[PDB]
Structure formats: structure tokens, C-alpha cells
Design a protein around this motif. Sequence first.
Motif, PDB file in Angstrom:
ATOM      1  N   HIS C  73       0.818  -1.206   0.000  1.00 34.76           N
ATOM      2  CA  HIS C  73       0.000   0.000   0.000  1.00 34.76           C
ATOM      3  C   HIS C  73       0.855   1.260   0.000  1.00 34.76           C
ATOM      4  O   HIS C  73       0.490   2.249  -0.645  1.00 34.76           O
ATOM      5  N   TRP C 129      -6.566  -7.490   2.199  1.00 30.79           N
ATOM      6  CA  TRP C 129      -6.342  -6.612   1.055  1.00 30.79           C
ATOM      7  C   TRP C 129      -7.402  -5.519   0.986  1.00 30.79           C
ATOM      8  O   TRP C 129      -7.086  -4.345   0.766  1.00 30.79           O
ATOM      9  N   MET C 133      -5.714  -2.065   2.463  1.00 35.35           N
ATOM     10  CA  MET C 133      -5.262  -1.284   1.318  1.00 35.35           C
ATOM     11  C   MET C 133      -6.393  -0.508   0.656  1.00 35.35           C
ATOM     12  O   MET C 133      -6.229   0.671   0.328  1.00 35.35           O
TER      13      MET C 133
END
Lengths: 90, 97, 190, 107
Positions: C73, C129, C133
Motif C-alpha cells: 500500500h 487486502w 489497502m
Amino acid sequence: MYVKLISSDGHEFIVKREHALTSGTIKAMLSGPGTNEVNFREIPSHVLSKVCMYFTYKVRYTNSSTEIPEFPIAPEIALELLMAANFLDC
Amino acid sequence: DVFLMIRRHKTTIFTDAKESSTVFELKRIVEGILKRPPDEQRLYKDDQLLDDGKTLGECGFTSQTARPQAPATVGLAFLCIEPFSSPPELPDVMKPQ
Amino acid sequence: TSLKPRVVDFDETWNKLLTTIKAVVMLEYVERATWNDRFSDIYALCVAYPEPLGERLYTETKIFLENHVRHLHKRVLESEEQVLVMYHRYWEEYSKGADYMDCLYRYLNTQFIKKNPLMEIGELALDMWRKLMVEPLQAILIRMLLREIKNDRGGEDPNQKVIHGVINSFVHVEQYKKKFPLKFYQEIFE
Amino acid sequence: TSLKPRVVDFDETWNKLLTTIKAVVMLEYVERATWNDRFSDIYALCVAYPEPLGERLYTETKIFLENHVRHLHKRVLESEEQVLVMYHRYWEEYSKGADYMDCLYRY
């Protein structure tokens, strides 16, 4: 079409892919990174031979209309094969 | 049907050759995975040589002898087949220690 | 050795497994013999004596996962004006790595995670995820998607793989949510 | 050793018992140690592992006694005019032999 399996004692067992897909984790063995090579550092030769015979027993007797005979798991090879059956998800 | 295993001193070939097929089909099956011509290598049941034209059905490979639970074993020579590393023995319980 | 429970040291096997997990998540390459060794070790860690180490293994795999997603990220943040094109390829690599991670942690995913909250290893990757992110940058990564599809009607067509590889990314990060197969994708993008 | 069950070959133990069982009948002399060891031999045969050799011991003893009494029958019938004397001479030995085997084979 055929996949080969390595015991902890160095023995090699070659069985068809469709027979070996019975085990839950052998599918993950054949998945991931790329006749496929499969090695077990724990599984000895006799229990892996029993599992490989169970593959042919399972696929042949799958959804049969007759009385399926029970797989002869010998009393001496019982706990080592039970550990293999759990680990292999067979 | 006949389910049998084919071993060459470290290996084991699990086949599904029917009673109609003879030795030649198993030779082709071995060639399909071990890449060896039938002229180079021959199989050995126990200590006996099988004719190529002789069907496995009369070679003692009956259905009740070669079930997938305990498939029949044949030796492959390109014998000295290494033993399966038999599991440890169990106490006999009724044996007086 | 055999399949019996033993007293295995968690630190050394964790260090051995971290290299393979790193080689899986970015989808570089893994040796197949090493892969079989990692299966043989993922089994032995879950049934370790006296106390099974599956809990420690899960709670440290999630730490590795979160710091990996945090590093990627930051990589997304530093890549100005190329967030979406790089996002597509990184998401494809991460999804394939997550599938191979679910394959890698098969025994832990069927003997300890299903026993208990906790989440599947393959489904933990996609969830981390989207929750580590996507959450900081949910607005930026979608404004360009709407602008590109609006520009297609306006004349400026976008690349096929760049815009179609993210419209299904929101679909895949909710596969574990069987009750919401497409609810998240509809509300945040469509 | 110990008097727990153990694996014994019936041929050797029965051969050891035979030289004493043919001496307790048609009375002869056997040592005290020998006669006390035959008790342990009988116990071992009747309590062996895996299968107790009680039936085998019974059948072998029955065959031996049948052979012995028919041998005595031949030895008496061959001697005429002294059937009574030979019969009593063998009977005063065989009755005590039977009463001694009923003690040796008590187990």
C-alpha cells in the motif's frame, strides 16, 4: 495423466491423476507452483501404498449400486495409516 | 475388471487393465509413463515370464485375486524388489510378556 | 520420522515458512520440493506437542500478511498517476498468491480454522487486502474508474484489462461473504 | 523360569513324560527330582500358550495306556496255564500305576 508420489523411505508410487485427486491435500500438492513431483518426509512406504490402493478402491467403487466391501486396513498398519488419512484428507 | 500393480525395484504402477487386454497393453501403459519399449523391458509375475500374446486372464489374474483393495503385484525388469518397509509389529497381548 | 506429534520449535519453522510465503504472495517462484516440505511442515505445526501451534501460526501469518499489504500500500501511495494500471497487475498477482496460500495452508484451514472469529487463510488474504489497502484509498481508486468509463462514451476509451480487472476485484474480495456475493461491489462502484 | 504360561513343544515334553509314565505303570524306580519335575511338565502342557495341550496330552496318554494294556494282554495270553498268575502279577503293578498316574496327572 499419471502422478508420482515419494515416500519418506525413498519409494516411488505412480498413480493416475484422477485417482490421486481423492485426497483433499494432494489437490493442493498438485496446485501452486509447477507427471508431477510429490514428496512426503513423514509418510513411509507402507502407509502410502495403502493410500494408493485406497485411491483405486475409491474411484472404482464410487457411486456403485452394489454392496461395497470394506477397505482392509490391517491392524498393525492402522494408526500410521490413520495419521496419513488425516494429513492427506483422503 | 483387473486391478494390479507393476513394480520395478523402487516403483509401483497402478493400472486398470481389463481381462480382455493382454501383456502388450500393460507394456504400452508402462511406456506411456516410463518411456521404455516392450522389447527393452519385460514384466515378471512372481518368478515366471509371461508371453506377450498370452492374456493375463489365464495368468492367474482373476477378478477375485486382483481387486483394487489388494491389487496383484508383478515385477518389472529393464528380481530384486525392495520390501515395502513393513510397519512395526504389535504386542500379542495374550503373549506372556 | 513419522506423522506423530513432536515438540517442534516454532521459531525456526516459522522462519523456514516465511521465505516460501513471501515467494507465494508476490508470485515469483517456489520450488515444488520445497512446496512439499512446506506442506509437511504446515501439518506438523498444527499438531505440535504439547500444545498445538495452529493459533500462533495463524496469528503470526496474519501479521506477515498485514505488513506485506501495508508495504504494498505504501508502494501504491508512492506511485502517483499510475495507481490503477499497477493496481491491476498487483491485484492479479496477489489473488493468485492468495489462492496458492489457501492451498499452502490447507490443513490449518480445515482442522483449526473450521474448528472455530477466525477466517480462512485464503479468505484472510483478500479480506486483509480490502480492509487494509482499499480502505485508505477507496475514493481515489474508484473516481478514475468512473471517469474512464464515462470517457468511453465521451470518446476516450480506456484499456480493457485496466478497467475490467478491477470491476471484478471487488467481486473477489467478498467470496467468503456468501450472504453478500455482490452487495459490496454494487454499493461502492455501481 | 516361572510357572506362567509359555510356549513348549509337545513332542519333547511328551518324550520326557513318556520315560516316567512307562515307569509309574509296571512299577519301576524314578528319582524324586524326576517325579517332581514331571508335575511341572504336566502343568506346562495343560497351561501352554497359544493353545493348551490338554487334549493332546489326554489323547497321547490314552494311546500309551491302550498300547500298554494290549501289550500286557499279549504277554499274558502268550503264556498258557499261568493266565491267573501273570494276570495278577501285572495287575498288582498296573493298579498302583493307575493310582500313581491319577496323582501325576492330577492337574
